[PDB]
Amino acid sequence: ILAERRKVLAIDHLNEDQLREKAKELWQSIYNLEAEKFDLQEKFKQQKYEINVLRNRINDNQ
């Protein structure tokens, strides 16, 4: 699954400028991956927070 993000690579037949292109779309996919990661971080701080919430409830309401 990392490998469907460790996609196979093609650089040689890519002309210098075609290299610029594929590297650019790769960096776009990178930016998307950073977006995913950061939204997972925000969702995840919300997760950790509201699970602290959860256990607070667990204790106060066992």
Binding site: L14, K24, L26, W27, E34, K37, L40, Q47, K48, L54
Partner: protein
């Protein structure tokens, strides 16, 4: 405390909590887009020769792979915490619940057409 007093109190409380979750989130998101543009930096392609730009495509996919790994770890943790969210969520929806499912009381039916067809020409109330 007055009636509409407490009304506006509670509704503005909940809307404020909404919009402020959204404000922490928009600052979170500024943080996001900035850090994305940094750790996934606006690119630099040219100058590197054919072989060099080949290495460049290869390493930009390698960075695909790194952020792959990063977001993958984060989403695995997010999956575990979604799991735990739902787990303690129902656990407590029992703890403070087992009935936190409210009811639909029999007095709570629609009476509009009732008032109307009953009052006829004077169809006023509901």
């Amino acid at each position: 405390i007055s009636a509409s007093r407490k009304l506006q109190l509670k509704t503005l409380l909940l809307q404020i909590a909404k919009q402020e979750l959204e404000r922490e989130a928009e600052e979170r998101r500024g943080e996001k887009g900035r850090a994305l543009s940094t750790r996934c930096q606006p690119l630099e392609l040219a100058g590197l020769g054919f072989a060099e730009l080949q290495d460049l495509c290869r390493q930009l996919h390698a960075r695909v792979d790194k952020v792959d790994e990063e977001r993958y770890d984060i989403e695995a943790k997010v999956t575990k915490n979604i799991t735990e969210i739902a787990d303690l969520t129902q656990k407590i929806f029992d703890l403070r619940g087992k009935f936190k499912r409210p009811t639909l009381r029999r007095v709570r039916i629609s009476a509009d057409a009732m008032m109307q067809a009953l009052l006829g020409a004077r169809a006023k109330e509901s």
